[PDB]
Each structure stands twice: as C-alpha cells, then as structure tokens.
C-alpha cells in the first residue's frame, strides 16, 4: 500500500520567486501522481494530473515533474495569491493516498500590527461571564506574543489566541486574543491591558482600559 510524503511542512517565498514542492512515493508509481491547491476557506482545486499535465485554465507558472518515486511541483513567478496548501497524490493503485500538505506563504516587508482592545459588552456581563478581546491587525511575521496584564499583573491560563491565514492581496496576518473571566473576577480589578511584542515593534506595545470609562 503506497504512501506519499511531503517533507516540507512550510515554505516561504517572495513574490516573483521560484518555489519547488517535493513529494516522495514509497514505491514506483510511474507518473500516476496528481497535485492540488487548497486556498484558505476553499475546497481543494485540481492543478496537475499524471505528474506533469495541467488542466485547462491552470497557469503556466505551475509545473509538475518527476517519475518513479520523486515528484515536484514548481511555482515560478510566485504571486501573492498563490499562497495555499499544496497536496500531492498517487493514484497508481488503491488505496489512493495523499501527502500531508506543504503550506506556501509569501514573504514581505516587516509590518507592525495595529492594536485594539474591546471591553466586554453589557449583554455578556448580564449573563455572568466577561470576555475581553485584543485584536492585532495586518502585520507580518506571523510570530507575535500577546500578554494579558490585569492591574499590572500578568495572566496565564485564561487566554486563547486565533490567527487568520495570510491575506491574499497584502500579505499580512491578523490575530485575535480573548481573555475570559468570571463576572465576579472582572469587576474586582480596574486596569485591563494587552501587551504586544513583535518583530516590527522596537518595544512592547500596550493597549488598555479602565473598567467603567
């Protein structure tokens, strides 16, 4: 039963650059290999069949090659809209099997996140929980760090973070972090601060509010 493997989990490439995604079959599969592109929020789209043939409408910059066990999808002249997970697949035999997926991201100038903070609504306090939200908008390096400080005291264990996929036009990210707290705990302290560090900041940036204002 033939397995296919993609050894690259993540590749980073600049616009106009070249990027080669690799695929290794555990047995000779001739050219019975296919490639797929999955853009975020979308279902997989068929790019290449039998190792090197493009479907009508797939642009020339997508090139598949290989035979036997080693297969390759080369994206030349990469566009910011080419970001996606790219999957290879062997259909030489049943079971049909897929590689694990190679995420292709675009590199761009460092971009500093714009930071906002949201107090909990009055509907939510009425019901007994308090959710405080920190938004970090349109930044590059995906890497970032959010610290929730209550009355100047750093928290942990009551925060969850979420990151969008890379935007297809500009090539930025956005991040949401939620500080969840009981209504009891919420109105005991006054100062709620969101401490943000990132490569585009020379120092941590803090947004904050006082409960009530």
């Amino acid at each position: 039963e033939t397995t296919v493997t993609q050894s690259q989990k993540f590749m980073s490439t600049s616009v106009g650059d070249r990027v080669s995604v690799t695929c290794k079959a555990s047995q000779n599969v001739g050219t019975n290999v296919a490639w797929y592109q999955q853009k975020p929020g979308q279902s997989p789209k068929a790019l290449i069949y039998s190792a090197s043939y493009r479907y009508s409408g797939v642009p020339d910059r997508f090139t598949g090659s290989g035979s036997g066990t080693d297969f390759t999808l080369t994206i030349s002249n990469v566009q910011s809209e080419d970001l996606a997970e790219y999957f290879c697949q062997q259909y030489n035999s049943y079971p049909l099997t897929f590689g694990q997926g190679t995420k292709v991201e675009i590199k761009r100038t460092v971009a500093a996140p714009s930071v906002f903070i949201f107090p909990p609504s009055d509907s939510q306090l009425k019901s007994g929980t308090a959710s405080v939200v920190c938004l970090l908008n349109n930044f590059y390096p995906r890497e970032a760090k959010v610290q929730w400080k209550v009355d100047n005291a750093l928290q942990s264990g009551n925060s969850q973070e979420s990151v969008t996929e890379q935007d297809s036009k500009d090539s930025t990210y956005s991040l949401s972090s939620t500080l969840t707290l009981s209504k009891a705990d919420y109105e005991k302290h006054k100062v709620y601060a969101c401490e943000v560090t990132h490569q585009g900041l020379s120092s941590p940036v803090t947004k904050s509010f006082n409960r009530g204002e």
Partner: protein
C-alpha cells in the same frame, strides 16, 4: 458548469449511522467514476471511496471498510455514502469528487461531527468601536460550522473572521472584525449576520458605538 453539491452532514453520536448525498450537474454523470474524500481537522486529506460509472466497481480503504458504502443513482444524478458504526475519528469534512483516480472537480464539502455532546447555539456579542475597528464575538456553540458575514455579505473590505478555537468547556468560540472610516460611525449601520445551522440559529447583530 460542472457542479457537485453535498448535503447530510450532521452531529451524530458514536456508534451511529448517517447517509451523505451529492447532487451532480453540468456533466454526463452516468459516464464518470465518482469518489468521496474527507479532510480531518489537522487538514489531512484521506480518500474514502470510489465507484465506477456503472456501479460495477467500488473501492475502499481499510480504515472504513465494512462500515462505509458508496452507491449512485444514475437517474437522479446523485452520489451517496452510507456510514455506520461511526467513530470519533470519522469527524471530518466530506467532499464529493469526480473521477476515481485523481479528482478533477470537488464540491464544497459537508461536515460530519461524531460526538456525545449536544448541539448548542451561539451567544452573539458586539465588539464596540482615521479608521475604527468594530466586531462581533460568537461564543459557546458546539457543532462546528458557523458562518459570519457583515451587512448581508455586502461588506467584505477589511473583514477578518478568525478560525474557531476550542474552549476548555468543549464549546467553540470565534470573533469577526472589520475596519471602517471612523466618520462612518453614527451614519452607517453595521450588522454582523451569524448563522449556526446545526442549531437553526440565525442572528443579525447591530454593532454600534457606546
């Protein structure tokens, strides 16, 4: 022209059964092999069944053999997948796909959740506001697909809807924001339209400053 449209995904208890359907159009359905592929939360793709054009040949991987069966109706132009003895590990998005080797067209997917938990509809809370940022917090729902649009889908510039996170309570939660001209606040009305079909919950939340 080619279109494949799946339905029937639902929340099912472990050990249960459920049947998926796929309505096919834009092509001569009875001439094509057809398949089902699922995608797990870790985004891995796993092929689950294929059927020849006339139904004579069907194929399954060992992970599902004896529990899943594939059929078609070449009069209704419909593909089916019956599943029984469902396990937690069958939780996936199920795609219908054309042909039986590579897959040249895929549908949009329908979502199967195998769990002992019960449906719960979301609470919807406003994230109240150069540019201003406003948004919408969608808290404590369980079966997974929630959809969020702004102003009935007409406002898309600057919208960021964040992936759902799994809270320690077993409930999902999610935020959606958008950036707008600050001078539009107090003229324009901004509505976040939340739909959680697993609970037949539909909310249109006006988000305003205060």
């Amino acid at each position: 022209e080619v279109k494949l449209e799946e339905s029937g995904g639902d929340l099912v208890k472990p050990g249960g059964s459920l049947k998926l359907s796929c309505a096919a159009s834009g092509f001569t359905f009875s001439s094509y092999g057809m398949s089902w592929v699922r995608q797990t939360p870790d985004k891995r793709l796993e092929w689950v069944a294929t059927i020849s054009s006339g139904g004579s040949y069907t194929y399954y991987p060992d992970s599902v053999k004896g529990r899943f069966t594939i059929s078609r109706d070449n009069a209704k132009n419909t593909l089916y997948l019956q599943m029984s003895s469902l396990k937690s590990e069958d939780t996936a998005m199920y795609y219908c796909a054309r042909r039986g080797f590579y897959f040249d067209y895929w549908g949009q997917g329908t979502t199967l959740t195998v769990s002992s938990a019960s449906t719960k509809g979301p609470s919807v809370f406003p994230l109240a506001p150069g540019t201003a940022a406003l948004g919408c917090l969608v808290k404590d729902y369980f079966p997974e697909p929630v959809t969020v649009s702004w102003n009935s889908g007409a406002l898309t510039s600057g919208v960021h809807t964040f992936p759902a996170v799994l809270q320690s309570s077993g409930l999902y939660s999610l935020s959606s924001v958008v950036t707008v001209p600050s001078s539009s606040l107090g003229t324009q009305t901004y509505i976040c339209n939340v739909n959680h079909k697993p609970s037949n919950t539909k909310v249109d939340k006006k988000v305003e400053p205060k």
